[PDB]
């Protein structure tokens, strides 16, 4: 009964997703319609900027990708996935893509600006979250993965850096740069070293269970203040990941440790989230016994904290990055590669 209504919700959610999946939205827009305010994040082929839309005064977070760098780093399909998926999803804990466009040089995804900053910065600052606090965030990720996986979407980059804290103290998942729609198995080596499942490292065909592994890492990191597998060199991190060995801080409850042993299960076929009972093994776990799943979805649970809000356009919750020019070439770069964008 509790389950039939979940089933109902999911079927409806799929209907909606497919309508947008099958005919993606397209805009319409130019870089010169925006004032750049601050770089919020950078990477090897793009960056994220706080911008103000001049005509309306609206603030947005604009992901800007350099087409030539995308192509050179063979990320074409991934950027296409990211735009197509983000425009089609609709869920309380997923960042909203407002619109997308492209010009001669760049691809643009204009998201709702979440001024609260990354969970990563808040976690690092406080040191660690209490189990009730970690559980509040974890429950939102569980619901979000239940949503995503029913749509055959694998997220593939869970980490506190990608979890924005909104003005209600709830999560907004951002960065769909590695998300993929795929039934069954996929093979790409992608993600973040500390968060990689063993089967990604071992170069196997892997599935949605990698997202549940990643949830184990996240819960561990939220509650300990550091990830379960760390070392100086990536190779050293990978050896630890595939070993089947993980130590817990002495303050972890026995219920938490039991959940983590089942999420950080190196054998994907025994990993929670990936057994016959699917997500319900997780949702029914003793560690989540006090979680009101529907109250979480409805945002009715008092959040552990609400980020300091200094008005529209405040960036105090983000780190400073070196501000670099955004170039727009006279000539169109990589036209055919990005025609579906």
Ligand X SMILES: C[C@@H](NC(=O)CCCCCNC(=O)[C@H]1O[C@@H](n2cnc3c(N)ncnc32)[C@H](O)[C@@H]1O)C(=O)NCCCCCC(=O)N[C@H](CCCNC(=N)N)C(=O)N[C@H](CCCNC(=N)N)C(N)=O
Closest separation in Å from C-beta 78 to ligand X: 8
Closest separation in Å from C-beta 156 to ligand X: 11
Instruction: Enumerate residues 4-43 that contact ligand X by CB under 6 A.
Output: 40-41, 43
Q: Which CB atom, from 96 or from 257, has the smaller least distance to ligand X?
A: 96
Instruction: Using only the alpha carbons of the chain, give its radius of gyration.
Output: 20
* Candidate residues 198, 216, 227, 307; the one interacting with ligand X per rule CB under 6 A: 227
Q: Which CB atom, from 48 or from 200, has the smaller least distance to ligand X?
A: 48
* Candidate residues 103, 152, 161, 337; the one interacting with ligand X per rule CB under 6 A: 161
* Candidate residues 93, 113, 145, 213; the one interacting with ligand X per rule CB under 6 A: 113
* 191 phi, psi to nearest 5 deg: 130, -155
For the question of residue 267 being annotated catalytic, the response is: no
Establish if 191 lies at the interface with ligand X (CB under 6 A): no
**Residues 6 or more apart in contact with residue 213 via CB below 8 angstroms:** 197, 198, 263, 264, 265, 268, 271
Q: Which CB atom, from 178 or from 291, has the smaller least distance to ligand X?
A: 178
Instruction: Consult the annotation and say whether 42 binds a ligand.
Output: yes
Of 166, 253, 232, 158, which Cα lies nearest the Cα of 200? 158
Q: Are the CB atoms for 274 and 268 separated by under 8 Å?
A: yes
Q: Looking at residue 118, what DSSP letter applies?
A: B
Establish if 158 lies at the interface with ligand X (CB under 6 A): no
Residues counted in the chain: 341
* Candidate residues 46, 191, 198, 216; the one interacting with ligand X per rule CB under 6 A: 46
d(CA 251, CA 246): 15
Q: Which CB atom, from 59 or from 150, has the smaller least distance to ligand X?
A: 59
Residue with tokens 């561990």: 220
Establish if 160 lies at the interface with ligand X (CB under 6 A): yes
Q: Are the CB atoms for 122 and 114 separated by under 8 Å?
A: no
Total residues binding ligand X (CB under 6 A): 29
Q: Please name every residue paired with 180 in a beta bridge, in sequence order, or none if there are none.
A: 154
Annotated binding site: 40-48, 63, 112-118, 159-162
Catalytic residues: 157
């Amino acid at each position: 009964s509790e389950q039939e209504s979940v089933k109902e919700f999911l079927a409806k959610a799929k209907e909606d997703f497919l309508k947008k999946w099958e005919s993606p939205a397209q805009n319409t827009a130019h870089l010169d319609q925006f004032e750049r305010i601050k770089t919020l994040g950078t990477g090897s082929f793009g960056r994220v900027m706080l911008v103000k839309h001049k005509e309306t005064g609206n603030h947005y977070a604009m992901k800007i990708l350099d087409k030539q760098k995308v192509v050179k780093l063979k990320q074409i399909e991934h950027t296409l996935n990211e735009k197509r998926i983000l425009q089609a999803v609709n869920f309380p804990f997923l960042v909203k893509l407002e619109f997308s466009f492209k010009d001669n040089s760049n691809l643009y995804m204009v998201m709702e600006y979440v001024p609260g900053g990354e969970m990563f910065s808040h976690l690092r600052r406080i040191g660690r979250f209490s189990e009730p606090h970690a559980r509040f965030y974890a429950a939102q990720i569980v619901l979000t993965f239940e949503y995503l996986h029913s749509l055959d979407l694998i997220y593939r980059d869970l980490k506190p850096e990608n979890l924005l804290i909104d003005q209600q103290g709830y999560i907004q998942v951002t960065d769909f740069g590695f998300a993929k729609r795929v039934k069954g198995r996929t093979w790409t080596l992608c993600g973040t070293p500390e968060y990689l499942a063993p089967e990604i490292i071992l170069s196997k065909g892997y599935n949605k269970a990698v997202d549940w592994w990643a949830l184990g890492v996240l819960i561990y990191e939220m509650a300990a203040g550091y990830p379960p597998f760390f070392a100086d060199q990536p190779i050293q991190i990978y050896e630890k990941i595939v070993s089947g060995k993980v130590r817990f801080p002495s303050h972890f409850s026995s219920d938490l440790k039991d959940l983590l042993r089942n999420l950080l299960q190196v054998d994907l076929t025994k990993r929670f989230g990936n057994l016959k009972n699917g997500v319900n093994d997780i949702k029914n776990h003793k560690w989540f016994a006090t979680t009101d799943w529907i109250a979480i979805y409805q945002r009715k649970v008092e959040a552990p904290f609400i980020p300091k809000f200094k008005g529209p356009g405040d960036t105090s919750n983000f780190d400073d990055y070196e501000e670099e020019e955004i170039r727009v070439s006279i000539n169109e770069k990589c036209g055919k590669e990005f025609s579906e964008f």
